Amino acid sequence: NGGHIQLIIGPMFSGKSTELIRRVRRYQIAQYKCVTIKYSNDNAALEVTKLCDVLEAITDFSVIGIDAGQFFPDIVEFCERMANEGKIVIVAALDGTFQRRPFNNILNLIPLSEMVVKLTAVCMKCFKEASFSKRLGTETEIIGGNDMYQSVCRKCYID
Amino acid sequence: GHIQLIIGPMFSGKSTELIRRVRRYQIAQYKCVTIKYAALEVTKLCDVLEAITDFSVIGIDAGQFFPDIVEFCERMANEGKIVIVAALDGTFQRRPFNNILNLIPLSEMVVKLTAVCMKCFKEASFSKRYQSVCRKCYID
Amino acid sequence: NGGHIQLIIGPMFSGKSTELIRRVRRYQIAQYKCVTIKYSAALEVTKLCDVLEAITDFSVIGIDAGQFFPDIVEFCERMANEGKIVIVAALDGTFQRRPFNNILNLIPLSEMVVKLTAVCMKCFKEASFSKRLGNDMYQSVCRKCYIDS
Amino acid sequence: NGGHIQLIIGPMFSGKSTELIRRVRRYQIAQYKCVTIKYAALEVTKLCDVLEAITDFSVIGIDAGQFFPDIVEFCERMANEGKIVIVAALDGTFQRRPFNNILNLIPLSEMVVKLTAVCMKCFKEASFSKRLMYQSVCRKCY
Ligand SMILES: Cc1cn([C@H]2C[C@H](O)[C@@H](COP(=O)(O)OP(=O)(O)OP(=O)(O)O)O2)c(=O)[nH]c1=O
Ligand SMILES: [Zn+2]
Ligand SMILES: [Zn+2]
Ligand SMILES: [Zn+2]
Ligand SMILES: [Zn+2]
Question: Which residues are listed for Zn(2+) binding in this entry (chain D)?
Fold first, then answer.
């Protein structure tokens, strides 16, 4: 009785969500019962805030794709339960916040995942490989596109 | 410039990976353009030399259909342009193609993606006339 | 600053150390100043903050079994901020599949992260976890074989 | 008829051989009967002669496979006998010209990966090989 967990991290603008739908479409086109979840009020996928709300619903599905997984506090127990019930869990999440500090409870999922990959963005200042996200406003994050965030490399993140 | 090459059987996601790699540059204020058999529909790649002269990022989908794929991609990468190609590596008989192999010794990055077998639900790496299958299901 | 951090994780018997010396030999064969560190040819230390002064003249730093070094985090960042390339091969999870928090705190700071797989020693499929019973007391297993034992 | 083929290409000094023995060590440490071939390990020039010998092995690793003329027939025949075949070969010559049958093996391979070296001129990403000894270079330096 075994599933697995695929983990996709990376900075903003690196394409995590698109890679998520590629892996999901791989199974869905092979007649898998696929469902996708994303975090509501972000800016065919379900929009929820707590994963404990959909624990009962997706019992009949074999493929679970989750976008913006760092926002779900119960992401780890959820993925472990589904992976132990024979379901394939694919997660696209941020590894670090704007302060390059760990995001919520998303790292505790790596000792439980079968595959972990980090994608790269393009730096919007020195047009090199970006691996960090940097907010442009004055708050201390807040969700947004590129108007307030930019994907940068190591040298451009510190001034 | 350089050449990124993405191969794999049908239903493996080559086109989606193509647009991901292209969108990475496009979001960084690159002048990006895409070609299929911003968007272009052509039959011969030697015909589009004039159009994309002002572009730095070139994406090509279903590159095996272009007979001059090998000369075109190099004759674009040697002018500082980034070329990202999503193409099939093998025909229905898992036989070599006319002139898509000759592009790999010139590419800087080459990756082969996998599909899901539509018969035995395992890893798929071949195409059969359509269904994507593995080795056991291809020669059952 | 000018450097970066490459992170190689995976269970035991997945080949992390071999991949480490491959990535280093790529730079070393290009006349880079490389140095390698291991836990107590490569230096053998217990605290990484002792060799901060020593390896100042090196551009490539490879570390094996990074989970054992408590100061792994503040080390790699400092080295990466001095223009140095830092390559780490460490375990992601213990035998209880619990995090090596010192290692996990390095991922939001790393430029590259990859997880390698081993081969299951019970049902011979892909393995991503380590279990206790040297090799005669550890085994690389998959999810199904980790719980059913 | 239930095996597969893993393919490793790249220029010189990219680490293809080290990756080869890493992938083989993965299986060998899991009590697989592994054997390695170069131009327990055998050293031969034609692969079609050792078909009978390695019948009891499930994992076959080949290095510098471009030098074996019968690499394709061998890898297909061996993969169709439940054996895992891992090949590490050069993708391009010193003239950036295609290889004899290494490419004709890609439509038959289950996994294909290309590794990169470090440029020995501008210390950037290298993907090509050049002659003087030998050096791994990028596009601009070639
Ligand atoms: C950097 C950062 C972002 N956010 C927010 C902003 C983002 O919209 C959201 C998650 O962003 P993502 O959806 O991961 O970024 P993206 O979808 O635009 O990039 P891609 O699809 O290519 O992977 O989280 C925070 O809440 N805190 C932070 O520190
Ligand atoms: Zn930058
Ligand atoms: Zn099949
Ligand atoms: Zn097992
Ligand atoms: Zn160079």
Answer: 119, 122, 138, 141
Q: Angle between the B14-26 and A16-28 helix axes, to the nearest 10 degrees?
A: 170
Q: Is the distance from CB of C101 to CB of C94 less than 8 angstroms? A: no
What atom of ligand 1 comes closest to residue A16's alpha carbon?
23
CA separation for the pair C141, D20 (Å, rounded):
22
Q: At what angle do helices D16-28 and C16-28 cross, to 10 degrees?
A: 170
Residues in C touching D30 (Cβ below 8 Å): 13, 118-121, 124, 140
Give resolution, Å, one decimal: 2.8
Tell me the nearest-neighbour CA distance from D21 into chain C, angstroms.
Answer: 9
Q: What are phi and psi of D27, to 5 degrees?
A: -80, -40
* Cβ contact D26–C13 (<8 Å): yes
Residues A154 and C1 sit within 8 Å (Cβ to Cβ): yes
Extended beta strands in chain A, E state:
4-9, 34-39, 46-48, 63-67, 88-92, 115-118, 121-122, 129-130, 132-135, 149-152
CA dist., res. B103 & res. B110, Å (int)? 10
The nearest CA of chain B is from the CA of D28 a distance in Å of 23
A111 CA from centroid of ligand 2 (Å) = 31
Domains of chain A: 4-119 (3.40.50.300)
